[PDB]
Amino acid sequence: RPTDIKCSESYQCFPVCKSRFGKTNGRCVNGFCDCF
């Protein structure tokens, strides 16, 4: 899902998502993290 976690780039999200939610990967949609 999309969040409100601000990001400039996708590789910023990926580890945050893996850490926090335990998701497989993350990607920066419209400057906000989308984890999946």
PDB file of C-alpha atoms in Angstrom:
ATOM      1  CA  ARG A   1       0.000   0.000   0.000  1.00  0.00           C
ATOM      2  CA  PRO A   2       0.893   3.686  -0.305  1.00  0.00           C
ATOM      3  CA  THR A   3       1.890   5.539   2.841  1.00  0.00           C
ATOM      4  CA  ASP A   4       2.742   9.049   3.965  1.00  0.00           C
ATOM      5  CA  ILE A   5       6.409   8.220   4.398  1.00  0.00           C
ATOM      6  CA  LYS A   6       8.172  10.855   2.335  1.00  0.00           C
ATOM      7  CA  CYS A   7      10.929   9.822  -0.043  1.00  0.00           C
ATOM      8  CA  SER A   8      12.938  11.271  -2.900  1.00  0.00           C
ATOM      9  CA  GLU A   9      13.868   7.900  -4.342  1.00  0.00           C
ATOM     10  CA  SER A  10      12.739   4.304  -4.322  1.00  0.00           C
ATOM     11  CA  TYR A  11      15.836   2.759  -2.789  1.00  0.00           C
ATOM     12  CA  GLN A  12      15.114   4.878   0.258  1.00  0.00           C
ATOM     13  CA  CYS A  13      11.813   3.096   0.731  1.00  0.00           C
ATOM     14  CA  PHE A  14      12.828  -0.455   0.008  1.00  0.00           C
ATOM     15  CA  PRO A  15      14.841  -1.039   3.189  1.00  0.00           C
ATOM     16  CA  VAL A  16      12.384   0.960   5.259  1.00  0.00           C
ATOM     17  CA  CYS A  17       9.563  -1.245   4.032  1.00  0.00           C
ATOM     18  CA  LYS A  18      11.564  -4.414   4.553  1.00  0.00           C
ATOM     19  CA  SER A  19      12.447  -3.228   8.037  1.00  0.00           C
ATOM     20  CA  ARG A  20       9.086  -1.895   9.116  1.00  0.00           C
ATOM     21  CA  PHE A  21       6.397  -3.878   7.358  1.00  0.00           C
ATOM     22  CA  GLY A  22       8.441  -6.845   6.198  1.00  0.00           C
ATOM     23  CA  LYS A  23       7.511  -6.212   2.585  1.00  0.00           C
ATOM     24  CA  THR A  24       9.543  -7.446  -0.353  1.00  0.00           C
ATOM     25  CA  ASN A  25      10.210  -4.137  -2.065  1.00  0.00           C
ATOM     26  CA  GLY A  26       9.224  -0.483  -2.066  1.00  0.00           C
ATOM     27  CA  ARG A  27       8.921   2.290  -4.623  1.00  0.00           C
ATOM     28  CA  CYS A  28       8.497   6.037  -4.421  1.00  0.00           C
ATOM     29  CA  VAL A  29       5.097   7.014  -5.766  1.00  0.00           C
ATOM     30  CA  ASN A  30       4.604  10.753  -6.040  1.00  0.00           C
ATOM     31  CA  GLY A  31       7.222  11.367  -3.382  1.00  0.00           C
ATOM     32  CA  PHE A  32       5.694   8.883  -0.968  1.00  0.00           C
ATOM     33  CA  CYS A  33       6.593   5.282  -0.293  1.00  0.00           C
ATOM     34  CA  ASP A  34       4.542   2.464  -1.744  1.00  0.00           C
ATOM     35  CA  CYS A  35       5.329  -0.914  -0.245  1.00  0.00           C
ATOM     36  CA  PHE A  36       4.556  -4.246  -1.864  1.00  0.00           C
TER      37      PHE A  36
END
